[PDB]
From a paper:
In this work, we describe the rational design, production, and characterization of K1K1, a novel minimal MET agonist consisting of two copies of the kringle 1 domain of HGF/SF in tandem orientation. Therefore, we designed a linker to bridge the distance between the C-terminus of the first K1 domain and the N-terminus of the second one. We chose for that purpose the four–amino acid long linker, SEVE, which is naturally present between kringle 1 and kringle 2 (K2) in HGF/SF.
The collected datasets enabled the determination of the molecular structures at 1.8 Å resolution and 1.7 Å for K1K1 and K1K1H6, respectively. Both proteins crystalized in space group P 1 21 1 with K1K1 having two molecules per asymmetric unit and K1K1H6 having one. Structurally, K1K1 and K1K1H6 are nearly identical with a backbone root mean square deviation of 0.8 or 1.8 Å, depending on which of the two molecules in the asymmetric unit of K1K1 is used for alignment with K1K1H6. In K1K1H6, good electron density was also observed for the poly-histidine tag possibly because of stabilising interactions between the histidine residues and residues of the N-terminal kringle domain. Surprisingly, like the revelation of seeing the first structures of NK1 that presented a likely biologically relevant dimer, both crystal structures show a pseudo C2 symmetry around a central axis and present both receptor-binding sites in nearly identical orientation on either side of the molecule (located around residue Glu37 in the first kringle and residues Glu120 in the second kringle, equivalent to NK1 residue Glu159). For p-Akt, both K1K1H6 and K1K1 show similar phosphorylation in the low nanomolar range with no significant effect caused by the presence or absence of the poly-histidine tag. We next confirmed the direct binding of K1K1H6 to recombinant human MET-Fc chimera, a soluble dimeric protein comprising the whole extracellular part of the MET receptor (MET922 fused to the Fc region of human IgG1) at different concentrations using the AlphaScreen technology.
Author numbering: 4 to 177
């Protein structure tokens, strides 16, 4: 993805513009800037196209030589990856803390039988993180994470959690 973890020493994404907005120079090119980061000599460091990279693992994060003759190199401005509430596909793996249904009803705790009695006991679904009153999809059903609701007239309802594809840092269409 196009965010970095730590200093991005293994960053392999597609950002190709510096912090000040300068288009990166290709690693294979000596123009404008002549240099020794030859892709054939630095394999495993994935010096591909003109993508920002951190081949030496430095504090600045990924950087590139720049297409501006007056600026030899510059760090890139790549956000640090941060956890956001989202699901992939149907949310079989969702372990977030959303606890309200799509119609805004507070979820009932999984450990509770009130108002709705049920057989989704946390002790019987070890591994599925039936914690507190958090929306979950413990049998990997279509429709996604859901909960029993605190409203006695609504036994259960799906929760509306955004798809991670809406918020993530995508590889560009290159």
């Amino acid at each position: 993805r196009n965010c970095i973890i730590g200093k991005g020493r293994s960053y392999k994404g597609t950002v190709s513009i510096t912090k000040s907005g300068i288009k990166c120079q290709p690693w294979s090119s000596m123009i404008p800037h002549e240099h020794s980061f030859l892709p054939s000599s630095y394999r495993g460091k994935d010096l591909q196209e003109n993508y920002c990279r951190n081949p030496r693992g430095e504090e600045g994060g990924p950087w590139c030589f720049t297409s501006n003759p007056e600026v030899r190199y510059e760090v890139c401005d790549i956000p640090q990856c941060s956890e956001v509430e989202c699901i992939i596909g149907k949310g079989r793996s969702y372990k977030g803390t959303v606890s309200i249904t799509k119609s805004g009803i507070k979820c009932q705790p999984w450990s509770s039988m009130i108002p709705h009695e049920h057989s989704f006991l946390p002790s019987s679904y070890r591994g599925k993180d039936l914690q507190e009153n958090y929306c979950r999809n413990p049998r990997g059903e279509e429709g996604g994470p859901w909960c029993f609701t605190s409203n006695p007239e609504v036994r259960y309802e799906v929760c509306d959690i955004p798809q991670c594809s809406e918020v993530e840092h995508h590889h560009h269409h290159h």
